[PDB]
Amino acid sequence: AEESSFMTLFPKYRESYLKTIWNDVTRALDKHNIACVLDLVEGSMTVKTTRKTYDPAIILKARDLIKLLARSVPFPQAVKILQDDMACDVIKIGNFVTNKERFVKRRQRLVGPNGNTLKALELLTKCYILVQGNTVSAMGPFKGLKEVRRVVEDCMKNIHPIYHIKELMIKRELAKRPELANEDWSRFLPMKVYTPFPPAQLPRKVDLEI
């Protein structure tokens, strides 16, 4: 029985917070008989199976946990990844647009004023969403992750997320009505040739006198 291991590097600024919580991380992983190591010299965190490990798939969740911790997700939130329902998704957004200003403004649109748009999406989708640089890292149930991807990608294609927030609220009330389960919900939802050589310059008045 060979040992399956995963290792993830983390930034140096994130070292201080990992040192404090590593006892909690060790305790959480010990419940599944998964051993972990925190190397501050190399700046890496490793998770490895043991001979007492019984769940074959837990190492994959343990790998996701250390990845989340490296990306500045707080441990009380990240430790939920060990649960079967929860999953982690990373959405690229750097490739949708080519104008820097248009990229920045649309990304802010995802956050919204005071973070209101982002918080509303998290509440409706039950997902933890964190917008970083050219990517959006979202964690939560698989149904929520699927919804978050649509909103994030649509935002970068000029669809205001406020439409998606409204759509999710309407879909939720419809999900609680049994009569309209079969019927389509769309009606309720809101709707000369180039010359290489320059032309000559107009001479200055002094040039004319010369």
Binding site: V111, G115, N116, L123, T135, I165, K166
Partner: protein
């Protein structure tokens, strides 16, 4: 932009999360989230016509307490912003004078005491 329910939910999302499907409907919402939500709504309507001094009044606190409360809250904001800055996290924009509204703002009801900003510095 003119949907009252949708706009209300977006503005009130921070209070509802702090004091918790999410119960955002008025009939469903109970507890502190109800009391804070009603007050938040009533202040918004009163801002248009009510005089600035009269509508909002910071609760009376001694100086050595309030100055201490402001200092600790500002330190939390700086830590929050530095941690986001050193990471890649994108944060909502805040005007220069105003304090950023971190999660601790909503839970601790800090604004009723310290206020949105230091008025003395804003006036000058």
């Amino acid at each position: 932009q003119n949907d009252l329910e949708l706009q209300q939910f977006l503005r009130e999302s921070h209070l509802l999360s702090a004091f918790n499907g999410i119960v955002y409907q008025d009939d469903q919402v109970i507890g502190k989230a109800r009391s804070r939500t009603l007050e938040m709504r009533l202040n918004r309507l009163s801002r248009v016509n009510g005089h600035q001094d009269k509508i909002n009044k910071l609760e009376k606190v001694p100086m050595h307490i309030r100055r201490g409360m402001i200092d600790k809250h500002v330190k939390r904001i700086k830590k929050y912003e530095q941690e986001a800055a050193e990471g890649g996290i994108v944060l909502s924009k805040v005007k220069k004078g105003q304090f950023r509204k971190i999660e601790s703002t909503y839970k601790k009801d800090i604004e009723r005491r310290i206020g949105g900003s230091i008025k003395a510095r804003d006036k000058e």
